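Notebook B, p. 112. Complex prediction, attempt 2.
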Amino acid sequence: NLVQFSYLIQCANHGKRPTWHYMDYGCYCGAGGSGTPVDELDRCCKIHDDCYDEAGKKGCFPKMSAYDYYCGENGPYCRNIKKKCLRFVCDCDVEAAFCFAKAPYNNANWNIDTKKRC
Amino acid sequence: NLVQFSYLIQCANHGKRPTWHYMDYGCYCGAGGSGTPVDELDRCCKIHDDCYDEAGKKGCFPKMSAYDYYCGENGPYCRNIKKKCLRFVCDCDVEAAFCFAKAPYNNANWNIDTKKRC
């Protein structure tokens, strides 16, 4: 679920920005998304949206499902194996959390005019 | 001293970027400095350099002197009163640590071509 995704993000970035900083960025980091992704970070979010759409079409409820994970000193990882829907959702979130942590955060792309730019 | 300035910075930013990220940024964040400061963060560093130059001309050894400070939940602050050189140095560092924490960090301005741009 989204509570868990926030935990993964913070695990991956070592607590270096709040999760809410990723909730209204570019064309895709946030609820919607269409248009060309504005930078590497926005491309992470586009992948994540496509991952959640796939999960919902699989009957996995990515926003409702509580999955098993661990936050190591390596960063986070998924722990489900037998519960396949749980694993698929957790993999979307882990990949995005590492993507977010590696991508540069461009302040000019926080809270943009999505109508004019997307 | 610089060990203490690093503690203030991390206090002020809640551990959100490493101190070393402020050691080669723009024209002024780092050892030297001349030219027009490239952004708000670079202007913080220019002020800090001017503050250290003043302290050295006062006989305060800003890089050698260990001052008294506290890191609160409010962020950091200086504790010297009677030891005036200690207080002056600590004030340079505290002001810069809050300035750094408030300024936007523009990745395009990390490790620039100072010869071409300063």
